[PDB]
Design a protein around this nucleic acid. Structure first.
Ligand SMILES: [Mg+2]
Ligand SMILES: [Mg+2]
Ligand SMILES: [Mg+2]
Ligand SMILES: [Mg+2]
Ligand SMILES: [Mg+2]
Ligand SMILES: [Mg+2]
Ligand SMILES: [Mg+2]
Ligand SMILES: [Mg+2]
Ligand SMILES: [Mg+2]
Ligand SMILES: [Mg+2]
Ligand SMILES: [Mg+2]
Ligand SMILES: [Mg+2]
Ligand SMILES: [Mg+2]
Ligand SMILES: [Mg+2]
Ligand SMILES: [Mg+2]
Ligand SMILES: [Mg+2]
Ligand SMILES: [Mg+2]
Ligand SMILES: [Mg+2]
Ligand SMILES: [Mg+2]
Ligand SMILES: [Mg+2]
Ligand SMILES: [Mg+2]
Ligand SMILES: [Mg+2]
Ligand SMILES: [Mg+2]
Ligand SMILES: [Mg+2]
Ligand SMILES: [Mg+2]
Ligand SMILES: [Mg+2]
Ligand SMILES: [Mg+2]
Ligand SMILES: [Mg+2]
Ligand SMILES: [Mg+2]
Ligand SMILES: [Mg+2]
Ligand SMILES: [Mg+2]
Ligand SMILES: [Mg+2]
Ligand SMILES: [Mg+2]
Ligand SMILES: [Mg+2]
Ligand SMILES: [Mg+2]
Ligand SMILES: [Mg+2]
Ligand SMILES: [Mg+2]
Ligand SMILES: [Mg+2]
Ligand SMILES: [Mg+2]
Ligand SMILES: [Mg+2]
Ligand SMILES: [Mg+2]
Ligand SMILES: [Mg+2]
Ligand SMILES: [Mg+2]
Ligand SMILES: [Mg+2]
Ligand SMILES: [Mg+2]
Ligand SMILES: [Mg+2]
Ligand SMILES: [Mg+2]
Ligand SMILES: [Mg+2]
Ligand SMILES: [Mg+2]
Ligand SMILES: [Mg+2]
Ligand SMILES: [Mg+2]
Ligand SMILES: [Mg+2]
Ligand SMILES: [Mg+2]
Ligand SMILES: [Mg+2]
Ligand SMILES: [Mg+2]
Ligand SMILES: [Mg+2]
Ligand SMILES: [Mg+2]
Ligand SMILES: [Mg+2]
Ligand SMILES: [Mg+2]
Ligand SMILES: [Mg+2]
Ligand SMILES: [Mg+2]
Ligand SMILES: [Mg+2]
Ligand SMILES: [Mg+2]
Ligand SMILES: [Mg+2]
Ligand SMILES: [Mg+2]
Ligand SMILES: [Mg+2]
Ligand SMILES: [Mg+2]
Ligand SMILES: [Mg+2]
Ligand SMILES: [Mg+2]
Ligand SMILES: [Mg+2]
Ligand SMILES: [Mg+2]
Ligand SMILES: [Mg+2]
Ligand SMILES: [Mg+2]
Ligand SMILES: [Mg+2]
Ligand SMILES: [Mg+2]
Ligand SMILES: [Mg+2]
Ligand SMILES: [Mg+2]
Ligand SMILES: [Mg+2]
Ligand SMILES: [Mg+2]
Ligand SMILES: [Mg+2]
Ligand SMILES: [Mg+2]
Ligand SMILES: [Mg+2]
Ligand SMILES: [Mg+2]
Ligand SMILES: [Mg+2]
Ligand SMILES: [Mg+2]
Ligand SMILES: [Mg+2]
Ligand SMILES: [Mg+2]
Ligand SMILES: [Mg+2]
Ligand SMILES: [Mg+2]
Ligand SMILES: [Mg+2]
Ligand SMILES: [Mg+2]
Ligand SMILES: [Mg+2]
Ligand SMILES: [Mg+2]
Ligand SMILES: [Mg+2]
Ligand SMILES: [Mg+2]
Ligand SMILES: [Mg+2]
Ligand SMILES: [Mg+2]
Ligand SMILES: [Mg+2]
Ligand SMILES: [Mg+2]
Ligand SMILES: [Mg+2]
Ligand SMILES: [Mg+2]
Ligand SMILES: [Mg+2]
Ligand SMILES: [Mg+2]
Ligand SMILES: [Mg+2]
Ligand SMILES: [Mg+2]
Ligand SMILES: [Mg+2]
Ligand SMILES: [Mg+2]
Ligand SMILES: [Mg+2]
Ligand SMILES: [Mg+2]
Ligand SMILES: [Mg+2]
Ligand SMILES: [Mg+2]
Ligand SMILES: [Mg+2]
Ligand SMILES: [Mg+2]
Ligand SMILES: [Mg+2]
Ligand SMILES: [Mg+2]
Ligand SMILES: [Mg+2]
Ligand SMILES: [Mg+2]
Ligand SMILES: [Mg+2]
Ligand SMILES: [Mg+2]
Ligand SMILES: [Mg+2]
Ligand SMILES: [Mg+2]
Ligand SMILES: [Mg+2]
Ligand SMILES: [Mg+2]
Ligand SMILES: [Mg+2]
Ligand SMILES: [Mg+2]
Ligand SMILES: [Mg+2]
Ligand SMILES: [Mg+2]
Ligand SMILES: [Mg+2]
Ligand SMILES: [Mg+2]
Ligand SMILES: [Mg+2]
Ligand SMILES: [Mg+2]
Ligand SMILES: [Mg+2]
Ligand SMILES: [Mg+2]
Ligand SMILES: [Mg+2]
Ligand SMILES: [Mg+2]
Ligand SMILES: [Mg+2]
Ligand SMILES: [Mg+2]
Ligand SMILES: [Mg+2]
Ligand SMILES: [Mg+2]
Ligand SMILES: [Mg+2]
Ligand SMILES: [Mg+2]
Ligand SMILES: [Mg+2]
Ligand SMILES: [Mg+2]
Ligand SMILES: [Mg+2]
Ligand SMILES: [Mg+2]
Ligand SMILES: [Mg+2]
Ligand SMILES: [Mg+2]
Ligand SMILES: [Mg+2]
Ligand SMILES: [Mg+2]
Ligand SMILES: [Mg+2]
Ligand SMILES: [Mg+2]
Ligand SMILES: [Mg+2]
Ligand SMILES: [Mg+2]
Ligand SMILES: [Mg+2]
Ligand SMILES: [Mg+2]
Ligand SMILES: [Mg+2]
Ligand SMILES: [Mg+2]
Ligand SMILES: [Mg+2]
Ligand SMILES: [Mg+2]
Ligand SMILES: [Mg+2]
Ligand SMILES: [Mg+2]
Ligand SMILES: [Mg+2]
Ligand SMILES: [Mg+2]
Ligand SMILES: [Mg+2]
Ligand SMILES: [Mg+2]
Ligand SMILES: [Mg+2]
Ligand SMILES: [Mg+2]
Ligand SMILES: [Mg+2]
Ligand SMILES: [Mg+2]
Ligand SMILES: [Mg+2]
Ligand SMILES: [Mg+2]
Ligand SMILES: [Mg+2]
Ligand SMILES: [Mg+2]
Ligand SMILES: [Mg+2]
Ligand SMILES: [Mg+2]
Ligand SMILES: [Mg+2]
Ligand SMILES: [Mg+2]
Ligand SMILES: [Mg+2]
Ligand SMILES: [Mg+2]
Ligand SMILES: [Mg+2]
Ligand SMILES: [Mg+2]
Ligand SMILES: [Mg+2]
Ligand SMILES: [Mg+2]
Ligand SMILES: [Mg+2]
Ligand SMILES: [Mg+2]
Ligand SMILES: [Mg+2]
Ligand SMILES: [Mg+2]
Ligand SMILES: [Mg+2]
Ligand SMILES: [Mg+2]
Ligand SMILES: [Mg+2]
Ligand SMILES: [Mg+2]
Ligand SMILES: [Mg+2]
Ligand SMILES: [Mg+2]
Ligand SMILES: [Mg+2]
Ligand SMILES: [Mg+2]
Ligand SMILES: [Mg+2]
Ligand SMILES: [Mg+2]
Ligand SMILES: [Mg+2]
Ligand SMILES: [Mg+2]
Ligand SMILES: [Mg+2]
Ligand SMILES: [Mg+2]
Ligand SMILES: [Mg+2]
Ligand SMILES: [Mg+2]
Ligand SMILES: [Mg+2]
Ligand SMILES: [Mg+2]
Ligand SMILES: [Mg+2]
Ligand SMILES: [Mg+2]
Ligand SMILES: [Mg+2]
Ligand SMILES: [Mg+2]
Ligand SMILES: [Mg+2]
Ligand SMILES: [Mg+2]
Ligand SMILES: [Mg+2]
Ligand SMILES: [Mg+2]
Ligand SMILES: [Mg+2]
Ligand SMILES: [Mg+2]
Ligand SMILES: [Mg+2]
Ligand SMILES: [Mg+2]
Ligand SMILES: [Mg+2]
Ligand SMILES: [Mg+2]
Ligand SMILES: [Mg+2]
Ligand SMILES: [Mg+2]
Ligand SMILES: [Mg+2]
Ligand SMILES: [Mg+2]
Ligand SMILES: [Mg+2]
Ligand SMILES: [Mg+2]
Ligand SMILES: [Mg+2]
Ligand SMILES: [Mg+2]
Ligand SMILES: [Mg+2]
Ligand SMILES: [Mg+2]
Ligand SMILES: [Mg+2]
Ligand SMILES: [Mg+2]
Ligand SMILES: [Mg+2]
Ligand SMILES: [Mg+2]
Ligand SMILES: [Mg+2]
Ligand SMILES: [Mg+2]
Ligand SMILES: [Mg+2]
Ligand SMILES: [Mg+2]
Ligand SMILES: [Mg+2]
Ligand SMILES: [Mg+2]
Ligand SMILES: [Mg+2]
Ligand SMILES: [Mg+2]
Ligand SMILES: [Mg+2]
Ligand SMILES: [Mg+2]
Ligand SMILES: [Mg+2]
Ligand SMILES: [Mg+2]
Ligand SMILES: [Mg+2]
Ligand SMILES: [Mg+2]
Ligand SMILES: [Mg+2]
Ligand SMILES: [Mg+2]
Ligand SMILES: [Mg+2]
Ligand SMILES: [Mg+2]
Ligand SMILES: [Mg+2]
Ligand SMILES: [Mg+2]
Ligand SMILES: [Mg+2]
Ligand SMILES: [Mg+2]
Ligand SMILES: [Mg+2]
Ligand SMILES: [Mg+2]
Ligand SMILES: [Mg+2]
Ligand SMILES: [Mg+2]
Ligand SMILES: [Mg+2]
Ligand SMILES: [Mg+2]
Ligand SMILES: [Mg+2]
Ligand SMILES: [Mg+2]
Ligand SMILES: [Mg+2]
Ligand SMILES: [Mg+2]
Ligand SMILES: [Mg+2]
Ligand SMILES: [Mg+2]
Ligand SMILES: [Mg+2]
Ligand SMILES: [Mg+2]
Ligand SMILES: [Mg+2]
Ligand SMILES: [Mg+2]
Ligand SMILES: [Zn+2]
Lengths: 118, 13, 204, 131, 59, 122
RNA sequence: CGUGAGGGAAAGGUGAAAAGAACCCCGGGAGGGGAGUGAAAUAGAGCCUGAAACCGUGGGCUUACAAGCAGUCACGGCCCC
RNA sequence: GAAUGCCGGCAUGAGUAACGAUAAAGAGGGUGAGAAUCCCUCUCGCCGUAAGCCCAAGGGUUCCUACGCAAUGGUCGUCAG
RNA sequence: CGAUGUCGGCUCGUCGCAUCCUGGGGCUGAAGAAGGUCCCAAGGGUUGGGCUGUUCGCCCAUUAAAGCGGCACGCGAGCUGGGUUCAGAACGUCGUGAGACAGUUCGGUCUCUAUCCGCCACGGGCGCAGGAGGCUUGAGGGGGGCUCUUCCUAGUACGAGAGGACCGGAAGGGACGCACCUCUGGUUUCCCAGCUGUCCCUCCAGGGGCAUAAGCUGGGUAGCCAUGUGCGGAAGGGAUAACCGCUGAAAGCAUCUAAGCGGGAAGCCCGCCCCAAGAUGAGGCCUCCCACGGCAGCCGGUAAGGACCCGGGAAGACCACCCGGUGGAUGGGCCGGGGGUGUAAGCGCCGCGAGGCGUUGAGCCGACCGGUCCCAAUCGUCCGAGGUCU
């Protein structure tokens, strides 16, 4: 059973799934838009939203928090200095997901884009 | 009740 | 016979005479009668109750007709109580006073495809001593050439729960009419948020 | 509908607000209403609270005491009406929330591990000074 | 186990009765309100790149 | 929560130090015994010159369990051991003292003499 | 295939003549559609004839309250000559 | 018409079991008719008395480069022993 | 004999009744209590251990009782593999020997994939003469069915005494069943913290990877759970069994019977809980659409309504079910509360230092209860009646 359990497993063990979200986070904050499978995409939203929210705090503690997932000082500088300010007045929802219309040839996986909001 | 078996308990080919 | 519709809200214990008493809390009222089943017209006796107000934007025309002939705002759930016919146009928790015993009906939690151990409390297999991939299996399911078949009703794995369950003779611990609340002692089928029926008990 | 508020509403009548705050590590004396045939009296239970499991009206706390050569743990509901009063007898400083580990410890080792929480002690005597 | 096996070959009739559920459901499609091309709903239109009124994507 | 093979500290001066339950006297087929229930036990360990000696089959009432017991007032109480007091077929102590605290539940079940002889009743 | 002595297959046919299909069209190719050759191209090279099991497309009759070695005998309905 | 006959062909089981160590993946860029699978970059994970390196057997062009993707590759393939 | 796998155990039952217990009886050498013996009764129940491969049997401790049999000595395409049918080796015994022994001893390959029937669940199709949304009747099925102790009547009836009731009434149990998570108690794969070795970022401080598919350790929400909690067995009505009678002839008496009528079981029918109109015998009630255009038929656009697609869901293998889809709180964010963890980083002060103190119940923070249109459920499409005949 699965009654009221939150969080996909995505056929990865605990530490892999973690790495999965972190690496997608790096890619998303870097390029502003990535393409993935729909499930990875919906699952990416929250993980990254939290990171943006902390960069809106701006303080040392929050930077050191974000660094635990993002690990890259420069990318975090980009997060704090360029990205986060765009969201000063925005109350959550800093990411969107829209499904592409074509499936992967080799396995038929449904794709979606995940991008940062304006 | 302990009757004797009638089949030999199978060997592999 | 008397009854009401309601939703299961949750569980607590209250104190009464230096005793902790476990209760399930039920939001029962208010239920307007929307139709009465009569022996001349229907062949038996009942009252159709409505429960929980609904956005008319979601109620189709055949449903809208039914409500209007009763002069009743659109409601989310319709359900009948058998051999119960209230004097009023509306049934509330007040039909129950503390101390009364009731029967509660709900929809049990759903275990989906349940093993033979969870469902029928089978002993399963041994966990060591040679047990071979049968630790949760049911064992034999029959005889041999006589009868050469498996009985109807053989307990086997399959879906479990999410089915109608009634637990009987529950004490009514309190009733808080101003909040349409019923306090029933003990356990009630189904999840919080679940629709439940509260009927006057059939036990003596 | 707010199912959480309804429950809180049901509970609200039975809620106590008159008990002192304590923490795991504190040494407490619970005065508990006891029935012993056919009268009812107050028996005191005094020991270290080793657990406080929270759930609003349904929070409960576990108190541990050594009685005549045997360990005794007692579980109390924090809003039970059978509690007359609770008296803080000492403030102990824990470094974790659940202190089960003190079960395998000597009375000497417990003493070393649960220092007097001087801060919260001073706080106690900081109040206890009323106009 | 003791290696179960088909006792009898399945008849042309019975094998085809099995397959009475194997028909594909056609793809569900809707016109893109911009370029009027046919595409699945709730997907960014893969011909013009529009969704929810706006241009989202380079086609 | 005592069952056959469960060892019990004996909380009296009968001479027994340890008993092993072999039956819980409470119906056709009780699985467990708790405070106030009578069991039949083998004397697994004793001290020289008591009433009881190693090998004896005796009766005892359980006075302390390590499994916490629940009470109608919402509370519970649990002990550091599983203990028992050796009795006669009249539910009376064979010894003249009992050691350590005992469960208040004993009183309800007519073990008054033991409740009295106990130094504490919790 | 076997270390080896040794064991040991399968596999023929366009047409009289290559006249073996220029060129165009869809296609990445394969393949096909026209054009062309030929008495003949369902003789087009995966080529004489091209049976059967087997797979499919179209049409007629029929089938979702019925009991079977599947036929047979009778009667009626529908479709065809 | 039967020899658990012989040779071949084609069925059934069936769109089923499986796709060969649970060291593990994600994204961006490029190429191309076509890309989860080829090249590049970044991030992640695995071996490290080895899952790195050097000999000898044995194998025999498998080495390097260009041009290919019918078959071989347990999927795909623009890649490849 | 071109194979019907063979003891015992485990698992899962189901049936018989020559009945072990519980229920109802008659006789007793039945005072009471407790037995004996036969009759009715198969609804339910029929414990845990020591020994042996054992079935069986003895034994210990209990019990209302610790029933006997059938189902290929029920059940190895369900498990085991201790016994017994292979090959090794030994003892006693027999045989010159090779070897052999209802004599013993130690060891010894038990086969991933279910076609059909049957079984447990779940759908798709068509039908239920108009098409539709709801709510229901219950033919007929299934489930359940156990029982003990103590107290009161009453130390009364009965007995010399010991002993000790019927009837009626009240409380508390064991085992089982169904649900549930407030409490008790579990788990809680990353919710928090502590710790080691190593590599890394960035030198310090602070952190990340790996040590398992959590490195280890202490804790732990919701969920799913039992050891935890609620509740169930009935009551009651009806008809019966053995058995007891009323009235009563044949047969002036007698006779429960031949006319007729009573009483009488845990058993039977109903009652309780669940499934159920494919109940093709396809039921019923409330409401909605409606009289379309072209030659019981056909094609075509529609109506009420449905489906597709999408956000989801204590619903779930897929399917189905349920809620929502911007005139919206469905999920994701965000915010508040809950809850867990147990006082973050940074800085200041103290100590040579490991550290300690204050800031600070701090910081972090899954699921729980809510709020909030910040993100996404954009935009749409396709089906879908015209009602046959007496
Ligand atoms: Mg699971
Ligand atoms: Mg959820
Ligand atoms: Mg989930
Ligand atoms: Mg997670
Ligand atoms: Mg999911
Ligand atoms: Mg994946
Ligand atoms: Mg997997
Ligand atoms: Mg993976
Ligand atoms: Mg790991
Ligand atoms: Mg770019
Ligand atoms: Mg969150
Ligand atoms: Mg990291
Ligand atoms: Mg998609
Ligand atoms: Mg799609
Ligand atoms: Mg596609
Ligand atoms: Mg592929
Ligand atoms: Mg075999
Ligand atoms: Mg009626
Ligand atoms: Mg009626
Ligand atoms: Mg009535
Ligand atoms: Mg309902
Ligand atoms: Mg399971
Ligand atoms: Mg389970
Ligand atoms: Mg169950
Ligand atoms: Mg078991
Ligand atoms: Mg088990
Ligand atoms: Mg077992
Ligand atoms: Mg076992
Ligand atoms: Mg095995
Ligand atoms: Mg094996
Ligand atoms: Mg195993
Ligand atoms: Mg099995
Ligand atoms: Mg068999
Ligand atoms: Mg049969
Ligand atoms: Mg269901
Ligand atoms: Mg009901
Ligand atoms: Mg009751
Ligand atoms: Mg009750
Ligand atoms: Mg809500
Ligand atoms: Mg709340
Ligand atoms: Mg709550
Ligand atoms: Mg509170
Ligand atoms: Mg509160
Ligand atoms: Mg010392
Ligand atoms: Mg101070
Ligand atoms: Mg096997
Ligand atoms: Mg066949
Ligand atoms: Mg077959
Ligand atoms: Mg055949
Ligand atoms: Mg078949
Ligand atoms: Mg066919
Ligand atoms: Mg078939
Ligand atoms: Mg658009
Ligand atoms: Mg002692
Ligand atoms: Mg001895
Ligand atoms: Mg003795
Ligand atoms: Mg060779
Ligand atoms: Mg040929
Ligand atoms: Mg020729
Ligand atoms: Mg020739
Ligand atoms: Mg060409
Ligand atoms: Mg071309
Ligand atoms: Mg071209
Ligand atoms: Mg190419
Ligand atoms: Mg060509
Ligand atoms: Mg051509
Ligand atoms: Mg020509
Ligand atoms: Mg001619
Ligand atoms: Mg041609
Ligand atoms: Mg021809
Ligand atoms: Mg020809
Ligand atoms: Mg050919
Ligand atoms: Mg010729
Ligand atoms: Mg030919
Ligand atoms: Mg041919
Ligand atoms: Mg054919
Ligand atoms: Mg056909
Ligand atoms: Mg019929
Ligand atoms: Mg028919
Ligand atoms: Mg037929
Ligand atoms: Mg026949
Ligand atoms: Mg016929
Ligand atoms: Mg012949
Ligand atoms: Mg032949
Ligand atoms: Mg054959
Ligand atoms: Mg064969
Ligand atoms: Mg054969
Ligand atoms: Mg032959
Ligand atoms: Mg052949
Ligand atoms: Mg085939
Ligand atoms: Mg399939
Ligand atoms: Mg199959
Ligand atoms: Mg399968
Ligand atoms: Mg394989
Ligand atoms: Mg598979
Ligand atoms: Mg492989
Ligand atoms: Mg293979
Ligand atoms: Mg693999
Ligand atoms: Mg894998
Ligand atoms: Mg690893
Ligand atoms: Mg993988
Ligand atoms: Mg790529
Ligand atoms: Mg690319
Ligand atoms: Mg180019
Ligand atoms: Mg290009
Ligand atoms: Mg590729
Ligand atoms: Mg490709
Ligand atoms: Mg790969
Ligand atoms: Mg490594
Ligand atoms: Mg090394
Ligand atoms: Mg090593
Ligand atoms: Mg070679
Ligand atoms: Mg080569
Ligand atoms: Mg190729
Ligand atoms: Mg290829
Ligand atoms: Mg190719
Ligand atoms: Mg080529
Ligand atoms: Mg390939
Ligand atoms: Mg391969
Ligand atoms: Mg190429
Ligand atoms: Mg190349
Ligand atoms: Mg190479
Ligand atoms: Mg034979
Ligand atoms: Mg045969
Ligand atoms: Mg055979
Ligand atoms: Mg066979
Ligand atoms: Mg056994
Ligand atoms: Mg039986
Ligand atoms: Mg009989
Ligand atoms: Mg007899
Ligand atoms: Mg009796
Ligand atoms: Mg009896
Ligand atoms: Mg009798
Ligand atoms: Mg008598
Ligand atoms: Mg006598
Ligand atoms: Mg007598
Ligand atoms: Mg007798
Ligand atoms: Mg006799
Ligand atoms: Mg008798
Ligand atoms: Mg019976
Ligand atoms: Mg029976
Ligand atoms: Mg039986
Ligand atoms: Mg036993
Ligand atoms: Mg032993
Ligand atoms: Mg045994
Ligand atoms: Mg035995
Ligand atoms: Mg015998
Ligand atoms: Mg024997
Ligand atoms: Mg003997
Ligand atoms: Mg008896
Ligand atoms: Mg026995
Ligand atoms: Mg016997
Ligand atoms: Mg038996
Ligand atoms: Mg049997
Ligand atoms: Mg036999
Ligand atoms: Mg038998
Ligand atoms: Mg047997
Ligand atoms: Mg057998
Ligand atoms: Mg038997
Ligand atoms: Mg079998
Ligand atoms: Mg076997
Ligand atoms: Mg066997
Ligand atoms: Mg078989
Ligand atoms: Mg042996
Ligand atoms: Mg022999
Ligand atoms: Mg030997
Ligand atoms: Mg001799
Ligand atoms: Mg000799
Ligand atoms: Mg011989
Ligand atoms: Mg022998
Ligand atoms: Mg023998
Ligand atoms: Mg022999
Ligand atoms: Mg023997
Ligand atoms: Mg032996
Ligand atoms: Mg061995
Ligand atoms: Mg042997
Ligand atoms: Mg053996
Ligand atoms: Mg086997
Ligand atoms: Mg399979
Ligand atoms: Mg099958
Ligand atoms: Mg069959
Ligand atoms: Mg079947
Ligand atoms: Mg259906
Ligand atoms: Mg069906
Ligand atoms: Mg179908
Ligand atoms: Mg009609
Ligand atoms: Mg109609
Ligand atoms: Mg309907
Ligand atoms: Mg019925
Ligand atoms: Mg039927
Ligand atoms: Mg029944
Ligand atoms: Mg009872
Ligand atoms: Mg008396
Ligand atoms: Mg007396
Ligand atoms: Mg007397
Ligand atoms: Mg008296
Ligand atoms: Mg009297
Ligand atoms: Mg007298
Ligand atoms: Mg007396
Ligand atoms: Mg009575
Ligand atoms: Mg009772
Ligand atoms: Mg049962
Ligand atoms: Mg149930
Ligand atoms: Mg729960
Ligand atoms: Mg909870
Ligand atoms: Mg809990
Ligand atoms: Mg807990
Ligand atoms: Mg974490
Ligand atoms: Mg970790
Ligand atoms: Mg370290
Ligand atoms: Mg580290
Ligand atoms: Mg480095
Ligand atoms: Mg450092
Ligand atoms: Mg981490
Ligand atoms: Mg590393
Ligand atoms: Mg690690
Ligand atoms: Mg380890
Ligand atoms: Mg842990
Ligand atoms: Mg870690
Ligand atoms: Mg724990
Ligand atoms: Mg917990
Ligand atoms: Mg939890
Ligand atoms: Mg339990
Ligand atoms: Mg009755
Ligand atoms: Mg009667
Ligand atoms: Mg008479
Ligand atoms: Mg008379
Ligand atoms: Mg007379
Ligand atoms: Mg007369
Ligand atoms: Mg008569
Ligand atoms: Mg007669
Ligand atoms: Mg009668
Ligand atoms: Mg009478
Ligand atoms: Mg009864
Ligand atoms: Mg129903
Ligand atoms: Mg119907
Ligand atoms: Mg119905
Ligand atoms: Mg009809
Ligand atoms: Mg019928
Ligand atoms: Mg109907
Ligand atoms: Mg009706
Ligand atoms: Mg019209
Ligand atoms: Mg016309
Ligand atoms: Mg149409
Ligand atoms: Mg959906
Ligand atoms: Mg579910
Ligand atoms: Mg789903
Ligand atoms: Mg679907
Ligand atoms: Mg909807
Ligand atoms: Mg819409
Ligand atoms: Mg809008
Ligand atoms: Mg929007
Ligand atoms: Mg609005
Ligand atoms: Mg929402
Ligand atoms: Mg929300
Ligand atoms: Mg979600
Ligand atoms: Mg929150
Ligand atoms: Mg808190
Ligand atoms: Mg501090
Ligand atoms: Mg600090
Ligand atoms: Mg200083
Ligand atoms: Mg200093
Ligand atoms: Mg300093
Ligand atoms: Mg919070
Ligand atoms: Mg949860
Ligand atoms: Mg939670
Ligand atoms: Mg929420
Ligand atoms: Mg919005
Ligand atoms: Mg609003
Ligand atoms: Mg018309
Ligand atoms: Mg007429
Ligand atoms: Zn478009």
């Amino acid at each position: 059973m699965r009654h009221l359990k939150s969080g996909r497993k995505l056929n990865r063990h605990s530490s892999h799934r973690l790495a999965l979200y972190r690496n997608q986070a790096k890619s998303l904050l870097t390029h502003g838009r990535i393409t993935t499978t729909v499930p990875k995409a919906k699952e990416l939203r929250g993980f990254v939203d939290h990171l943006i929210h902390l960069a809106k705090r701006g303080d040392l503690h929050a930077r050191r928090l974000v660094l635990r997932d993002l690990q890259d000082v420069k990318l975090v500088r980009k997060l704090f200095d360029e990205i986060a300010p765009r969201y000063r007045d925005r109350q959550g929802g800093y990411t969107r997901v829209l499904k592409l219309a074509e499936r992967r040839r080799g396995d038929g996986a449904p794709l979606a884009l995940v991008e940062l909001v304006e | 009740v302990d009757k004797p078996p009638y089949l030999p308990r199978p060997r592999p080919p | 016979m008397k009854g009401i519709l309601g939703v299961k809200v949750g569980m607590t214990r209250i104190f009464r005479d230096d005793r902790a008493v476990p209760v399930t809390v039920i939001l029962a009222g208010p239920c307007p009668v929307v139709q009465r089943r009569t022996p001349e017209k229907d062949g038996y006796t009942a009252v159709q109750l409505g429960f929980l107000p609904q956005n008319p934007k979601r109620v189709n025309r055949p449903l809208k007709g039914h409500f209007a002939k009763a002069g009743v705002e659109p409601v989310r759930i319709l359900r009948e109580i058998r051999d119960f016919n209230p004097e009023g146009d509306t049934v509330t928790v007040e039909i129950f006073k503390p101390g009364e015993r009731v029967d509660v009906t709900g929809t049990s939690k759903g275990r989906g495809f349940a093993g033979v151990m969870k469902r029928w409390n089978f002993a399963g297999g041994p966990d060591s001593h040679g047990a071979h991939k049968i630790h949760r299996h049911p064992g034999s399911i029959g005889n041999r050439k006589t009868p050469g078949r498996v009985y109807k009703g053989k307990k086997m794995a399959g879906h479990y729960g999410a089915e109608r369950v009634t637990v009987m003779n529950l004490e009514v611990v309190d009733v808080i009419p101003e909040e349409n609340l019923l306090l029933v002692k003990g356990a009630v089928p189904g999840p919080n948020g679940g629709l439940v029926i509260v009927r006057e008990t059939k036990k003596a | 509908m707010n199912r959480g508020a309804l429950i809180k509403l049901v509970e609200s009548r039975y809620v106590r607000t008159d008990l002192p705050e304590f923490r795991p590590g504190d040494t407490v004396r619970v005065s508990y209403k006891v029935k012993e045939g056919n009268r009812t009296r107050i028996q005191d239970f005094e020991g270290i609270v080793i657990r406080i499991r929270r759930n609003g009206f349904n929070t409960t706390f576990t108190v541990r005491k050594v009685s005549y050569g045997v360990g005794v743990e007692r579980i109390f509901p924090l809003h039970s009406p059978l509690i007359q009063k609770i008296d803080i007898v000492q403030r102990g400083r824990a470094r974790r929330a659940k202190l089960y580990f003190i079960r395998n410890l000597s009375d000497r080792e417990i003493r070393r591990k649960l220092r007097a929480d001087r801060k919260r002690i001073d706080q106690d005597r900081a109040a206890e000074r009323a106009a | 186990a003791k290696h179960p096996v088909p006792k009898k070959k399945t008849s042309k009739a019975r094998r085809d009765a099995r397959r009475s559920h194997h028909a594909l459901t056609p793809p569900t499609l809707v016109p893109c309100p911009e370029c009027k091309a046919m595409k699945p709903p709730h997907t960014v239109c893969p011909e013009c790149g529009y969704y929810a009124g706006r241009k989202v994507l380079e086609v | 929560m005592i069952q056959p093979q469960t060892y019990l500290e004996v909380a009296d001066n009968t001479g027994a130090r340890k008993i092993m339950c072999i039956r819980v006297l409470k119906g056709s087929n009780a699985k467990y015994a708790t405070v106030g229930d009578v069991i039949v036990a083998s004397v697994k360990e004793a001290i020289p010159r008591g009433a009881v000696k190693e090998g004896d089959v005796v009766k005892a009432v359980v006075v302390r369990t390590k499994k916490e017991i629940k009470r109608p007032d919402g509370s519970a109480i649990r002990f550091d051991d599983n203990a028992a007091v050796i009795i006669n077929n009249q539910l009376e102590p064979r010894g003249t003292r009992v050691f350590g605290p005992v469960a208040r539940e004993l009183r309800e079940k007519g073990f008054m003499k033991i409740v009295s002889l106990a130094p504490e009743v919790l």
